[PDB]
Amino acid sequence: MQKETVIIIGGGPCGLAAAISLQKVGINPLVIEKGNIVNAIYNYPTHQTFFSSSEKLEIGDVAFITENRKPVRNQALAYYREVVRRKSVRVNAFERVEKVQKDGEAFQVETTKRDGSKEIYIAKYIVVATGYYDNPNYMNVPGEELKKVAHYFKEGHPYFDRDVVVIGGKNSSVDAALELVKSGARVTVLYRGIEYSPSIKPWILPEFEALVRNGTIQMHFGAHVKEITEHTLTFTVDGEALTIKNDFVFAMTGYHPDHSFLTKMGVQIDEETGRPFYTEDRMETNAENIFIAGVIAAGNNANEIFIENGRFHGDAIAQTIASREK
Amino acid sequence: MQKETVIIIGGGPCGLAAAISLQKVGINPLVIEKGNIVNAIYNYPTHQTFFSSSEKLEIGDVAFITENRKPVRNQALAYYREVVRRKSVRVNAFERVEKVQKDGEAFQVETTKRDGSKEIYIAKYIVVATGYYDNPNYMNVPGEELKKVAHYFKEGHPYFDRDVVVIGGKNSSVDAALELVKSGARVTVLYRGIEYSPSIKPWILPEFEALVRNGTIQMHFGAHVKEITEHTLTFTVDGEALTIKNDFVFAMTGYHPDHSFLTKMGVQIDEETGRPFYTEDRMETNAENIFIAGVIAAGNNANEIFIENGRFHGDAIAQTIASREK
Amino acid sequence: MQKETVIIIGGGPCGLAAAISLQKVGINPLVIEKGNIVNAIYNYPTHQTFFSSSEKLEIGDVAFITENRKPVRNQALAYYREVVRRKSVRVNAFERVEKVQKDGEAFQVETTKRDGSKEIYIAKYIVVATGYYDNPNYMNVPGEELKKVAHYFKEGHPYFDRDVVVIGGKNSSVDAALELVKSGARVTVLYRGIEYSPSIKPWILPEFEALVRNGTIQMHFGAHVKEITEHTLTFTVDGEALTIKNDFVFAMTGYHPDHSFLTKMGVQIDEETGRPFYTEDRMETNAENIFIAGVIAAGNNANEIFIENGRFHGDAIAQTIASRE
Amino acid sequence: QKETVIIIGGGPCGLAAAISLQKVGINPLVIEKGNIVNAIYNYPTHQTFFSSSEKLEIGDVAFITENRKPVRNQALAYYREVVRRKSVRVNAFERVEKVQKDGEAFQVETTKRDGSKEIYIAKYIVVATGYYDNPNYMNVPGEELKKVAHYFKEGHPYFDRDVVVIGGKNSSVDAALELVKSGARVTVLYRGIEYSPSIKPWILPEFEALVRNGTIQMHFGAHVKEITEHTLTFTVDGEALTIKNDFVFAMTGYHPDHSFLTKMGVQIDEETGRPFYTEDRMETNAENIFIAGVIAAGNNANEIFIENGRFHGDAIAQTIASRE
Ligand SMILES: Cc1cc2nc3c(=O)[nH]c(=O)nc-3n(C[C@H](O)[C@H](O)[C@H](O)COP(=O)(O)OP(=O)(O)OC[C@H]3O[C@@H](n4cnc5c(N)ncnc54)[C@H](O)[C@@H]3O)c2cc1C
Ligand SMILES: Cc1cc2nc3c(=O)[nH]c(=O)nc-3n(C[C@H](O)[C@H](O)[C@H](O)COP(=O)(O)OP(=O)(O)OC[C@H]3O[C@@H](n4cnc5c(N)ncnc54)[C@H](O)[C@@H]3O)c2cc1C
Ligand SMILES: Cc1cc2nc3c(=O)[nH]c(=O)nc-3n(C[C@H](O)[C@H](O)[C@H](O)COP(=O)(O)OP(=O)(O)OC[C@H]3O[C@@H](n4cnc5c(N)ncnc54)[C@H](O)[C@@H]3O)c2cc1C
Ligand SMILES: Cc1cc2nc3c(=O)[nH]c(=O)nc-3n(C[C@H](O)[C@H](O)[C@H](O)COP(=O)(O)OP(=O)(O)OC[C@H]3O[C@@H](n4cnc5c(N)ncnc54)[C@H](O)[C@@H]3O)c2cc1C
Ligand code: NA
Ligand code: NA
Ligand code: NA
Ligand code: NA
């Protein structure tokens, strides 16, 4: 089987950052990515604007210069392609890592390639950089399985003249709602919190709150969805149910990390905090030679880590592996 | 059954134009559309720019104002949503017309709604405005059924650092190849023709020719694809076969109208140029009170009907239907 | 001499709206504009975004559809050209109205053409729609006449690596300051007020406030500029003077109507606020058959009138003139 | 006061030359009469580059675009970040007036923004002044009228006006297209007998299409004879034709400042408009005076772009470091 010094699981911004940090200390690691690079950004809404200035998304010292103050999805996609090209990062794309298990003082890494075939690698060190956008916080309500329900937003156009519910109260729900209004949908927002979430970016709240206050966006605080049918949706507020006409649902209920992936390879999870155990100055978990990078290191507050700070995890990893040599 | 004077099948630009033309003679017809309005434009590539100025896309005298010279996909989407709102066009969306059958002096139209249920309408006149983008020209080659083969192009990003073949010599083939180069794919173009088609827009060809001349795009004229496998593609030129490494295929071989749908309706087709029989000054087919509007009326390898001239078909239909309704 | 029923002075959005309103009652008036149509928007900052959605800028029922939520300068320019073309509004462009004088039961209108020649018109009714962007609120401090001092902002690029002061506290000041920061200028903002103006776009204030908080923008409330030199600027806060290094000044201190123009034609103005006297149900001034349209009706401070509501003044003018023939 | 190298002009090629010298251990002084990339700043607002953004990169600073071709404001943002990231030394708003030999060094006299004078002594000179500052004047009556412009910025204020564009350059075609989009009534006059071969092949079709459908009046073999406030007169064949005209864009191209070059000892041949230089060093016939950018181009001012002009600094830097 194929031997690697380091395998990085995940080719998002923070896994790519860790690859480059390792290159700078003389190790050219293998990134294994189930889609192509920055798959999460590719799966952002088509016209998404970042909240970070573009300088704060830079990795590998490659300049990310923009004429506007904040970049959009397609600009970031172009940037990270150029980073990977200029730095010759090694990416095995369309390859899903299935399992990581101890094998002596190394690790066997089993994968599934695009055509369905299996592959096994031996690696001395592992960087888990898998993020969490693959794992929606499902509601587990009847009808959530219908095709009219989605946990990702792409574009508003096809919801023109339709009745649409957005579930959630954070920026993904506000962004989808505003795009849906612009596209001519009739929008209802349902949110379990009792007031506007303090996480809504201060430059987006004014427009959203104004559309709520004048009734353009119907908004139910303290709402808990109970049922989704093809043409209706039922929710409760203070235990009293309301049923509304509904064509499509965007369940913008957040995401969670796949901790079963970590625990199966020896990494412990800290209850109450929800973080994997790691030592910050190495970004090494409790499992020797298993490191983490990016938002996979966050706890119950999934917003602790983003690109601006997660892009530096690879620096501590590279310093540690370099000192240990191969 | 719901009674209608006119049913328009398809809510693309030309079907919507025909609706507004009928409004001017006192008939607000029912448009039945299997997605939402201008589904074909929604399914254009994300980066798409029109070759027409925006004035030539206008319908219903609704101004289409652009600061740039040529509109882009999302500008046209916003425009046609506002046309339908401002002109009160009646659209039954997410509803697919399955059958049109003469009943007496009217037509029975059977449909499937989004929830799978069936509807039946009785209409005095039919306008078929279904375009051709739904029906790719299949190459009839082993392996074309694989998921790695697409007959549509959407975005280039996930093909970064992949070996990609584009098949065809249409504007769409050239456009896809250029966007794939921009996205860092390694692009091979295969075309059965021996020279560049004269239909390639004269302002698009020089960039493509330059990338062929400097070796960036591998270009094979007189190429016929014989086989697609998961990892290879085999084609012949002058009978000599070549197998190349290949990850993904864009079969950009054009589209054709749904003649089966027309022939089951009673409409005759010309066998060598797939053009339905119709009288141009009425846009009425050989089947009494079944009209056509838009690019469906075109034949050979098209290039005769686009939005600029297809948007006026409804004027002839409306004048004919008005005469028979007074 | 050329005879007109109605002459509209100024071809900005509200003057054009007044023309289309009069068209709808059978009167196609003459618009006389010293530049070309919507000169004021043409002289907005290059990358300016409107605070109104595009539907609120529409006139003459001409659709103003945008893919984004707020239009930018170049989109509005394209829109109003198409309005004038599609509605066949008559515009005499590059023609400056110099005087309006009563002449029987009509008005003599004297103008200066682009080539320097003079022209005279007789109009039965006058609509003054001249706005205020032509007339900065000057600070009358020494050094204000130096070429390094401007009362308009266009683009930030050439102020890269330069020390720049922005004076004022309206959206124009905040927008200029942010663009200058993005362009690499070292920005100081000086404002005579003691808190943020409630007119600042609520979605723009947080970015500005964040840049004051982290020290990127030097912000001085209660500031009064006392002197400008080629390389310095002196201002006081609480009577304490501070002198700072300074290359360029953007005095974004607002604008006021052409008072000499209105009073010489017989219109009364309030000397403190600058507002002309008028009756809102007709938009007619104290001088019979002289009307006003647009932001000129709002004065040395304005704000209360913008395109959103000013685009409707012509309706009241049209109903009045139509009934009077 | 003293330097080592002074670069005259802070356009892309002058800035590239500065970073190339930095690579060899010399941090030179750029003196620019406006701010950096003044010429790009004075491009038309709508301007799109014909080069992909990779071809505009200097100093290995990535120029990332999602679009295929960058626009004016993207390049402005790029070159500002380059100057910041590389710490290029720029004396802005300072016009170099004279360069004169002084011993084995050079005296350079400048005028600052406030009017002050300054003098530096430099061992080497790089002349990177471009040509966009010096329009090819037509020397015809009426060219001095304010209705005549040798630069194009925006089309909007020409809405519903009669406008003449003179010239057969890409800039002429570009201006005509933008004026049509802005609703001007456009006549194009060109002394040549057919469409100029320099027009980019992806721009000519749009222009020819508007000529063929009658939107643009196009006169070949046209020589302007007079411009008044409301008319313009030109000849075609032997026939003089007078048309109504409000505004004129004289898009006749540009030429380097040959007076500035000759006065410092640079020879410019006669027929071409090219300075004498050796390409391997980009050094002129005057020792230790170099050229960088489009100033090196002759009669065919298309032969040097940013794409290849951005490398002149490398041959400069090699030659200077060898002599240091
Ligand atoms: C709409 C939106 C806007 C945002 N705006 C910003 C912003 O402005 N600034 C900011 O800092 N953050 C922003 N974020 C958050 C940002 O997307 C994340 O912080 C970032 O993606 C984290 O990077 P990562 O490398 O840790 O994980 P990810 O980018 O999620 O990458 C993990 C990768 O691992 C891959 N993967 C997972 N499992 C496997 C497996 N078994 N085998 C192989 N590959 C696997 C996935 O395909 C994925 O590409 C935004 C997020 C959204 C949704
Ligand atoms: C990349 C690209 C760029 C283009 N650029 C231009 C350009 O610049 N200018 C231009 O004029 N043209 C352009 N075209 C062509 C343009 O898309 C067509 O001319 C136009 O779509 C024709 O309009 P139509 O209404 O006749 O058909 P369509 O737009 O194809 O509309 C047909 C509709 O019928 C619906 N439908 C089909 N079958 C059924 C059914 N059984 N029941 C219900 N609904 C049904 C479909 O969902 C679809 O919405 C471009 C095309 C592409 C692909
Ligand atoms: C940066 C900026 C952003 C703005 N954003 C918005 C926004 O989002 N929404 C909004 O509603 N408003 C906005 N405004 C305000 C808007 O510009 C004004 O409300 C609008 O211009 C008022 O229209 P008007 O026709 O009354 O005046 P103007 O547009 O000023 O028109 C007056 C015209 O009269 C002409 N004129 C003057 N004197 C003479 C003379 N003697 N002879 C002939 N012609 C003459 C001028 O050349 C000018 O074209 C913004 C303003 C600025 C500066
Ligand atoms: C509309 C347009 C589009 C173009 N598109 C492209 C394109 O896509 N790709 C491409 O490669 N090229 C393009 N060009 C050409 C491009 O502008 C030039 O190739 C480029 O500017 C050359 O760079 P430079 O540094 O040599 O000269 P310039 O950029 O002209 O720089 C010369 C500088 O010297 C300064 N200067 C002059 N005299 C003095 C003095 N006495 N003292 C101090 N400073 C002085 C000037 O202010 C100026 O900033 C385009 C040009 C135009 C007009
Ligand atoms: Na919720
Ligand atoms: Na083919
Ligand atoms: Na002030
Ligand atoms: Na000429």
For the CA of D249, the nearest ligand? 8
Q: Phi, psi at residue C101, to the nearest 5°?
A: -140, 135
Q: Which residues contact C206 (CB under 8 A, 6 or more apart)?
A: A202, A203
What resolution (Å)? 1.6
Helix segments in D168-257, DSSP class H? 170-181, 204-212
> Which residues 6+ apart lie within 8 Å of D10 measured at CB?
D30, D31, D32, D35, D36, D37, D38, D90, D92
Q: Which amino acid is at C132?
A: Y
SS3 label, residue D278 = strand
Query: A62: distance to nearest CA of chain D, Å?
Result: 6
CB–CB of A129/A13 below 8 Å? no
Compute how many other C-beta atoms are within 10 angstroms of the C-beta atom of residue A301: 10
3-state secondary structure D18-33: HHHHHHCCCCCEEECC
* Residue A220 token pair: 């139910």
Q: Which residues pair with B291 in a beta bridge?
A: B127, B284
Query: What number of H helices and E strands is found in chain D?
Result: 8, 18
Rounded to an integer, what distance in angstroms lies between the CA atom of residue D98 and that of residue C238? 49
Q: C104-131 in b/e burial notation, b at 16+ Cβ within 10 A?
A: eebbebebeebeeeebebebbbbbbbbb
Among D32, D93, D97, D111, the mutation site with the greatest number of ligand 4 atoms within 8 A of its Cβ is D32
Give the number of other CB atoms < 10 A from CB of residue D301: 22
End-to-end CA distance of chain B: 24
CA end-to-end span of chain D? 19
Task: Report chain C residues whose CB lies below 8 A from the CB of D163.
Answer: none
Q: For the beta carbon of residue B140, count every other beta carbon within 10 angstroms.
A: 7
Least Cα separation, residue A50 to chain C (angstroms):
14
Reduce the DSSP state of residue B205 to 3 states and report it.
Answer: helix
Find the angle CA(D216)-CA(D218)-CA(D219) to the nearest 5 degrees: 160
C-alpha closest to that of D186 among D143, D247, D250, D228: D247
Listed in sequence order, the residues at least 6 apart from C271 whose beta carbon sits closer than 8 Å to its beta carbon are none
DSSP letter, residue A318 = H
Q: Which ligand is nearest to the CA of B168?
A: 6
Nearest Cα to A227, choosing from A208, A242, A207?
A242
Q: Buried (b) or exposed (e) across A35-74, using 16+ Cβ within 10 A? A: bbbbbbbbebbbbbbbeebbeebbbbebbbbbbeeebbbb
Q: What is the 3-state secondary structure (H, E, C) of chain C?
A: CEEEEEEEECCCHHHHHHHHHHHCCCCCCEEECCCCCCHHHHCCCCCCECCCCHHHHCCCCCCCCCCCCCCEHHHHHHHHHHHHHHHCCEEECCEEEEEEEECCCCEEEEEEECCCCEEEEEEEEEEECCCCCCCECCCCCCCCCCCCEECCCCCCHHHCCCEEEEECCCHHHHHHHHHHHHCCCEEEEEECCCCCCCCCCCCCHHHHHHHHHCCCCEEEECEEEEEECCCEEEEEECCEEEEEECCEEEECCCECCCHHHHHHCCCCECCCCCCECEECCCCEECCCCEEECCHHHCCCCCCCCCHHHHCCHHHHHHHHHHHHC
Count CA atoms within 13 Å of residue C209 on its CB side: 12
- CA nearest neighbour of B253 among B132, B169, B179: B169
Q: Which of B2, B28, B4, B7 minimizes the C-alpha distance to B118?
A: B2
How deeply is D304 buried, as exposed, middle or buried, from its count of CB atoms within 10 A (0-12, 13-18, 19+)?
buried
> In this structure, what token pair is assigned to residue C255?
């604008």
Within 6 A (CB) of ligand 3 lie C 9-15, 32-35, 39-40, 44, 48, 50-52, 96-97, 129-131, 133-134, 172, 258, 294-295, 306-308, 310
Dihedral angle, C-alpha C198, C201, C205, C207, nearest 10 °: -170
**Distance between Cα D5 and ligand 4 center (Å):** 20
Measure the CA–CA gap between C227 and B168, rounded to whole angstroms. Answer: 70
Cα–Cα distances (Å) from D227 to D139, D161, D187, D254, in that order, read 11, 16, 14, 21
Question: Ligand 6 being an ion, which residues bring their Cβ within 5 A of it?
Answer: B 168, 191-192
Q: Which helix (H) or strand (E) holds A181?
A: helix A171-182
Q: How many CA atoms lie within 13 A of D235 on its CB side?
A: 6
Beta carbons of A166 and A180 less than 8 angstroms apart: yes
d(CA C38, CA D177): 21
Q: What is the identity of the amino acid at A324?
A: R
**Distance between CA atoms of D79 and D77, rounded to whole angstroms?**
6
CB A150 within 8 A of CB A251: yes
**DSSP secondary structure letter of residue B276:** B
Cα(first)–Cα(last) distance of chain A, in Å?
A: 18
Cβ separation C67–B78 shorter than 8 A: yes
| Distances in whole angstroms, Cα of residue A200 to Cα of each of A69, C67, C228, D5 | 19, 23, 43, 53
Q: Which two tokens stand for residue A215?
A: 């009734």
Count CB pairs under 8 A between chains A and D.
Answer: 34
D319 phi and psi angles, rounded to 5 deg:
-65, -40
Which residues, 6+ apart, have CB-to-CB distance to B303 below 8 Å?
B199
Residues in A closer than 8 angstroms to C178, CB to CB, are: 69
Tokens encoding A133: 């956008």
**Residue with structure tokens 């289409």?**
B64
Tell me the Ramachandran region of residue D99: left when phi exceeds 0, alpha when psi lies from -120 to 50, beta otherwise.
beta
Calpha distance D246→C30 (Å, rounded): 20
CA of B37: how far to CAs of B92, B139, B152, B257, in Å? 9, 29, 19, 18
Query: Is B34 part of any known ligand binding site?
Result: yes
Question: Strands B107-113, B95-102: parallel, antiparallel or unpaired by DSSP?
Answer: antiparallel
User: Which two three-digit tokens encode residue D232?
Assistant: 């313009």
Cα(B146)–Cα(B249) distance, rounded to whole angstroms? 10
Rounded Cα distance between C182 and C216, Å, is: 11
Q: Are C314 and C27 in contact (CB under 8 A)?
A: no
A214 φ, ψ to 5°?
Answer: -95, 5
Q: Find the residue in C nearest to B72 (Cα).
A: C67
Rounded-to-integer distance, Cα C268 and Cα B9, Å: 63
Quote the CA–CA distance of A167 and A174 in Å, as a whole number: 10
User: Bridge partners of A97?
Assistant: A111
**C-beta of residue C1 within 8 angstroms of C-beta of residue C121:** yes
- As a whole number of angstroms, the distance between CA D187 and CA D219 comes to 8
Of D241, D247, D238, D168, nearest to D208 by C-alpha is: D168
- Say how far apart CA D170 and CA C188 lie, in whole Å: 42
For residue C212, CA distances in Å to B296, B309, C174, D39 come to: 60, 56, 11, 33
CA-wise closest residue to D38 among C159, C162, A69, C250? C159
The answer to whether the beta carbons of residues C29 and C7 sit under 8 Å apart is yes
- Token pair 């066009």 in the structure block, residue: B89
Minimal Cβ distance to C67: which of B62, B74, B86: B74
| Residue B50 with chain D: CB contacts under 8 Å | none
> Residue C65 and residue B67: Cβ atoms within 8 Å?
no
3-state class (DSSP) for residue B80: helix
At B148, list the tokens.
């790695």
- Cα–Cα distance list, B1 to B106, B111, B261, C191, D73 (Å): 12, 12, 22, 70, 59
Atom of ligand 2 nearest to the CA of B44: 1
Short-list D45, D12, D300, CA closest to D130: D12
Contact residues for A317 (Cβ-Cβ < 8 A; gap 6+): A18, A21, A22, A127, A282, A283, A284, A291, A293
**Are B172 and B254 in contact, with CB atoms under 8 Å apart?**
yes
Distance of alpha carbon A161 from alpha carbon B37, whole angstroms? 10
Q: What's the number of CA atoms in the CB half-sphere (13 Å) around residue D145?
A: 22
Q: Rounded to whole angstroms, how far apart are CA atoms C237 and C223?
A: 5
| Residues in chain A closer than 8 A to B148 (CB atoms) | 114
Nearest CA to ligand 4 atom 52: D43
Q: What is the signed CA dihedral for A300, A305, A306, A310, rounded to 10 degrees? A: -140
CB D51: neighbour CB atoms within 10 A? 13
Please report, in angstroms and rounded to a whole number, the separation of the first and last CA atoms in chain C: 21
Q: Are C220 and C189 in contact (CB under 8 A)?
A: yes
* Helix/strand/coil for A235: strand
The angle formed by the CA atoms of residues A199, A203 and A204, to the nearest 5 degrees, is: 70
Whether residues B93 and A47 touch (CB distance < 8 A) is answered with: no
Evaluate: CB of A307 within 6 angstroms of ligand 1.
Answer: yes
Residues A123, A325: contact at Cβ < 8 Å?
A: no
Residue type, D93: F
Burial class of residue D215, CB neighbours in 10 A (0-12, 13-18, 19+):
middle
Cβ proximity of B170 and B199 under 8 Å: yes
Give the count of beta carbons closer than 10 Å to the beta carbon of residue D237. 7
Do C157 and C179 form a contact (C-beta atoms < 8 A)? Answer: no
User: Is the separation of the CB atoms in B55 and B64 below 8 Å?
Assistant: yes
CA distance A77 to chain B (A): 7
Closest CA to B221 of B229, B212, B210, B211: B212
Q: Whose CA is nearest to atom 52 of ligand 1?
A: A44
CA of C74, closest CA in chain D: separation in Å? Answer: 9
CA nearest neighbour of C159 among C46, C250, C94, C274: C250
Question: At which residue do the structure tokens 């698009």 appear?
Answer: B204
Total residue count of chain C as it appears in this document: 325
* CA–CA dist D97, C320 (Å, integer): 64
At residue B167, the 3 state secondary structure works out as strand
**Domains and their CATH numbers in chain B:** 2-134+255-325 (3.50.50.60), 149-251 (3.50.50.60)
Measured in angstroms, how far is the CA atom of residue B43 from the centroid of ligand 2? 9
Tell me how far apart the alpha carbons of residues D53 and D313 are, in angstroms, rounded to a whole number: 19
3-state secondary structure of A12: coil
**Coil, helix or strand for B270?**
coil
Contact D212, D224 (CB under 8 A): no
DSSP E strand stretches across B148-306: 149-150, 163-167, 186-191, 218-221, 223-228, 232-237, 240-245, 248-251, 278-279, 284-285, 290-292
Q: What CA–CA distances, in Å, run from B34 to B37, B38, C63? A: 9, 10, 28
* Contact: D206, B203; criterion CB under 8 Å: yes
Tokens (6 digits) for A22:
């390792």
Q: Give CA torsion, residues B313, B319, B324, B326, to 10 deg.
A: 150
Q: Which ligand is nearest to the CA of A194?
A: 5
Do B168 and B275 touch, CB atoms closer than 8 A? Answer: no
- The answer to whether the CB of A278 is under 6 A from ligand 1 is no
Region of D139 please: left (phi>0), alpha (psi -120 to 50) or beta: left
Cβ–ligand 1 contact at A223 (below 6 Å): no
Structural method: X-ray
Q: Are B97 and C116 in contact (CB under 8 A)?
A: no
Spatial distance between the Cα atoms of A202 and C200, rounded to a whole number of angstroms: 14
Nearby residues of D272 by Cβ (< 8 Å), 6 or more positions away: D298, D299
Which residue type does A72 have?
Answer: V
Structure tokens at A205: 């709240």
DSSP string for residues in D66-126 = SSSS-BHHHHHHHHHHHHHHHT-EEE-S-EEEEEEEETTEEEEEEE-TTS-EEEEEESEEE
- The C-alpha atoms of residue A97 and residue A111 are separated, in whole angstroms, by 4
| A314 touches A18 (CB < 8 A) | yes
Cα–Cα distance between B285 and C167 in angstroms, integer?
71
C-alpha of residue A180 to centroid of ligand 3, in Å: 32
Three-class secondary structure of residue A177 per DSSP: helix
D15 within 8 A of D136, measured Cβ to Cβ: no
Q: Which amino acid is at C120?
A: I
Enumerate residues 6+ apart whose C-beta is below 8 A from B54: B64, B65, B66, B70, B71, B75, B79
Residues of chain C whose beta carbon is less than 8 angstroms from a beta carbon of chain B are 62-67, 72, 74-75, 77-79, 82, 86
Contacts of D189 (CB under 8 A, 6+ apart): D164, D165, D166, D167, D219, D222, D224, D234
Radius of gyration of chain A (CA): 21
Nearest CA to D273 out of D242, D236, D304, D316 is that of D304
Q: Which of C39, C40, C14, C15 is nearest to C29 (CA)?
A: C15
User: CA D135, D137, D142, D148: dihedral to nearest 10 degrees?
Assistant: -20
| Residue D67: exposure state from Cβ atoms within 10 A (0-12, 13-18, ≥19) | middle
Place of tokens 């102020």: C159
